[PDB]
């Protein structure tokens, strides 16, 4: 039972249980059913809350369909993984991640006038190794001026702070001039394209290093989990996993009437069907109706 | 794929590269007389110029049937490829069963023989736990929720430190 | 029975999606 705002998110979605709900909804609209009125109310706080809790319903079936490139050599499966995350973010309603984190920056420090409270209100959304390297530059400009350097653009203190911050940015490894000349725009399409290609080269290396860092975290977690598991004798492993499986079954079995409980138990029935169907003919895979 | 593709009978592969399957076409004006041989079965048919264009009309859309999910199966495949790297060094364990005879029992120190039998039981423990392969599907669900809540971001699923740092330069170094 | 479907078998199984649906159903009327 789709609620006319959930189905508007699943129209461009490409996973299974959302598209099946859309197909049932569109076959309902084929059999002479009216579409509900889309509600033009619920001022912007509830709007962004519904967007936040509705793009998660498109992201969460979409992450579990995206295979990690674990243990792979090369930047081609890492780029496959980051591209699938990009297509998932675009299906769920997000924009480019550059644009979305710039929007988070502009939404965070819209009412801050000093650079120090910009660095203290965008603290979570930047790395600590970069926030410290900006805080020391800000402290040096505070030693040079002995007055709070304001975040205006026409204030000259911000200019002599940014002239060091560009050197900080290029010494971190990211070309600040290429990024600024992309996101400012250019005169003709040739000198705009000449910096668009270089910003997309940096951006490709940026999200590829991001996905590679995520995959190295999952690889280290899998190695630590296995090396802690291979130190146990087998009976301890079997009783621990039967205890975990039974306790997480009964955590869904006590709660009854909800959608996630029946979906969990229908999924356990589907997993047991998969084990039976691979038992019936194991050299040909599971039986799919075709 | 897109809705309009433009491939077929034009800069196409006309001959095979493998000795296991032997394909050959007849590049005529419009049509093509193919002949394909894969072992003792043979097929030699004819495809029209407007017959490969309608091949990409219906889309295949290959999608995977997994036991739990493609994420969980990829994590479990990695855990199995780690179990193999442990198992390959349990494969190089020196054969202690050649020294079980009583001409090594009564020649050796009592404490060194107790140490040796403890080492053999330790090998049997390591080998019986590295080949508990059905526990990998439960270990792989101890990586799934932390990762899947990492991708449940308020910003973007594909976000990371480098993109946010580059856009923090773009936010800071532009005016206000 | 056996040979279920393909679009029924493309579902990622133990994904959340419904704890999210439960919170979005018990939060949005109560925050409105």
């Amino acid at each position: 039972a789709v609620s006319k705002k959930e189905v508007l998110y699943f129209l461009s979605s490409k996973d299974a249980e959302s598209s099946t709900a859309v197909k049932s909804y569109l076959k309902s609209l084929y059999a002479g059913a009216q579409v509900e009125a889309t509600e033009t109310d619920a001022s912007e706080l509830i709007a962004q809350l519904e967007k936040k809790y509705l793009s998660a319903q498109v992201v969460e079936p979409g992450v579990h369909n995206i295979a990690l490139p674990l243990g792979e050599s090369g930047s081609a499966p890492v780029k496959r993984y980051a591209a699938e995350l990009f297509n998932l973010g675009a299906q769920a309603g997000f924009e480019c991640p550059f644009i979305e984190v710039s929007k988070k920056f502009g939404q965070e420090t819209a009412t801050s006038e000093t650079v120090k409270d910009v660095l203290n209100k965008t603290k979570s959304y930047v790395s600590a190794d970069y926030n410290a390297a900006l805080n020391e530059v800000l402290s040096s400009v505070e030693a040079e001026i002995n007055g709070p350097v304001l975040f205006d653009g026409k204030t000259e203190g911000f200019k002599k702070f940014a002239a060091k911050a560009k050197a900080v940015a290029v010494s971190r490894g990211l070309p600040a001039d290429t990024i600024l000349a992309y996101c400012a725009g250019s005169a003709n399409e040739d000198a705009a394209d000449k910096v668009s290609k270089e910003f997309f080269t940096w951006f490709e290396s940026a999200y590829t290093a991001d996905a590679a860092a995520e995959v190295k975290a999952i690889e280290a977690e899998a190695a630590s989990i296995l090396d802690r598991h291979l130190a146990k004798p087998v009976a301890q492993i079997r009783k621990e996993q039967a205890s975990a499986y039974a306790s997480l079954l009964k955590r869904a079995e006590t709660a009854k009437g909800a959608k996630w409980a029946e979906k969990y138990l229908e999924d356990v029935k589907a997993v047991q069907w998969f084990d039976a169907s691979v038992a019936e003919a194991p050299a040909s895979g599971p039986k799919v109706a075709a | 794929l897109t809705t309009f593709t433009f491939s077929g009978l034009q800069d196409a592969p006309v001959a095979a590269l493998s000795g296991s399957i032997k394909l050959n076409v007849a590049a005529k004006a419009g049509k093509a007389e193919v002949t394909v041989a894969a072992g003792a079965a043979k097929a030699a048919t004819q495809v029209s110029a407007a017959a490969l264009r309608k091949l990409s009309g219906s889309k295949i859309s290959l999608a995977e049937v997994a036991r739990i999910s493609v994420l969980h199966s990829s994590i479990q495949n990695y855990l199995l490829s780690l179990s193999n790297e442990r198992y390959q060094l349990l494969s190089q364990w020196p054969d202690f069963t050649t020294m079980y005879g009583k001409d090594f029992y009564y020649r050796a120190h009592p404490e060194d023989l107790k140490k040796f039998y403890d080492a053999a039981d330790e090998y049997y423990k390591l080998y019986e736990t590295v080949t508990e392969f059905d526990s990998l599907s439960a270990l792989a669900s101890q990586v799934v929720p932390n990762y899947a809540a990492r991708r449940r971001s308020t910003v973007h699923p594909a976000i990371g430190s480098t993109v946010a740092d580059g856009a923090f330069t773009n936010f800071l170094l532009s005016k206000q | 029975a056996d040979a279920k479907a393909l679009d029924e078998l493309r579902k990622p199984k133990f994904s959340s999606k419904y704890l999210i649906q439960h919170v979005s159903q018990k939060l949005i009327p109560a925050v409105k």
């Binding site: 979570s124 930047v126 860092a213 280290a220 499986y245 997480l248 | 036991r67 929720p145 910003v155 | 999210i20």
Partner: peptide
């Protein structure tokens, strides 16, 4: 094989905390 369902969001953007290498290869070679 089944996992605890979590419903929480990650607001901060951190480096993903690459964990330490365990000693299992060294201990089994020993």
């Amino acid at each position: 094989y089944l996992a605890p369902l979590r419903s929480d969001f990650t607001e901060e953007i951190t480096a993903p905390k690459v964990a330490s290498a365990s000693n299992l290869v060294n201990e089994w070679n020993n």
